Design a protein around this motif. Structure first.
Motif: not given
Ligand SMILES: [Mn+2]
Length: 185
Positions: A134-136, A165-171, A4-13
Motif C-alpha cells: 500500500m506504499f508507492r 487508511l488506518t492508524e496502523s497504516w500511518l505508523e 512514532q505510533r504515538a504521532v500516528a494516532k494524532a495524524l489519524f484523528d
C-alpha cells in the motif's frame, strides 16, 4: 523513533473525516528547512535501497510535463525526445491538512500532507515509482525554471481509503519515511 505510533494516532484523528473523498492523496515528503528535495547523492542512495530490498514490489517510470494554469494542473505525455505530446490529465489539487514530522538530527525533514486531486509554469517530471504493498515510493527528477531537483515521497495506495487508511497504516508510513529520512548525507 519507535514511538512514532504515538504521532500516528494524532495524524489519524486529524484526517479521519476526509477519507470519504474519492480523490484523497496522502503523502509523506522528504525535504529540508521547507523545500521537498534531497541531494543527488542521497537520491541515488534511496533508489539503490528500494531497488534491492523490496522483492514483492512493482516498479514503473514515467516522464511528465506539468503546467499550472488557472489553478488547474495540466499533465502532458512525452515522446522519446522529451517534448509534450498531448494532455493526459486535468487536475486541481486542494490541500486539506499538512504538518511536518519531527525527525532525528541530521536526517531529512518529513512533510505529511493530505490533499485532494479532483479531475476536470513548466515542470518536467522524470518519475520512478516503486510500489510495495500500500506504499508507492515516488523518486522524481523535476526540472522547473532550469533547475533540476530530486524529490522523494511515499504515497498511499488503496482500494478503499475508508477501510484501508488506518492508524496502523500511518505508523508504517512513518517508519518507512524515517528509514529514508535517516539516509541524509
Ligand atoms: Mn503525489
Amino acid at each position: 523513533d519507535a514511538e512514532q505510533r504515538a504521532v500516528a494516532k494524532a495524524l489519524f484523528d486529524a484526517v479521519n473525516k476526509h477519507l470519504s473523498n474519492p480523490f484523497i492523496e496522502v503523502e509523506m515528503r522528504l525535504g529540508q528547512f521547507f523545500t521537498a528535495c534531497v541531494s543527488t547523492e542521497d537520491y541515488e542512495r534511496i533508489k539503490t535501497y528500494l531497488m534491492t530490498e523490496m522483492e514483492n514490489s512493482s516498479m514503473t517510470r514515467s516522464v511528465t510535463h506539468d503546467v499550472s494554469l488557472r489553478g488547474w494542473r495540466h499533465t502532458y505525455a512525452t515522446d522519446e525526445n522529451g517534448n509534450p505530446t498531448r494532455c493526459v490529465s486535468i487536475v486541481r489539487k486542494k490541500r486539506l491538512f499538512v504538518k511536518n514530522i519531527v525527525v532525528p538530527l541530521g536526517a531529512y525533514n518529513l512533510r505529511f500532507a493530505v490533499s485532494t486531486e479532483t479531475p476536470g509554469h513548466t515542470r518536467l517530471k522524470d518519475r520512478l515509482s516503486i510500489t510495495d504493498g500500500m506504499f508507492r515510493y515516488d523518486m522524481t527528477q523535476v526540472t522547473e525554471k532550469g533547475v533540476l531537483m530530486h524529490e522523494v515521497e511515499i504515497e498511499g495506495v488503496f482500494s478503499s481509503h475508508e477501510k484501508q487508511l488506518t492508524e496502523s497504516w500511518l505508523e508504517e508510513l512513518l517508519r518507512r519515511a524515517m528509514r529514508l529520512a535517516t539516509l541524509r548525507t
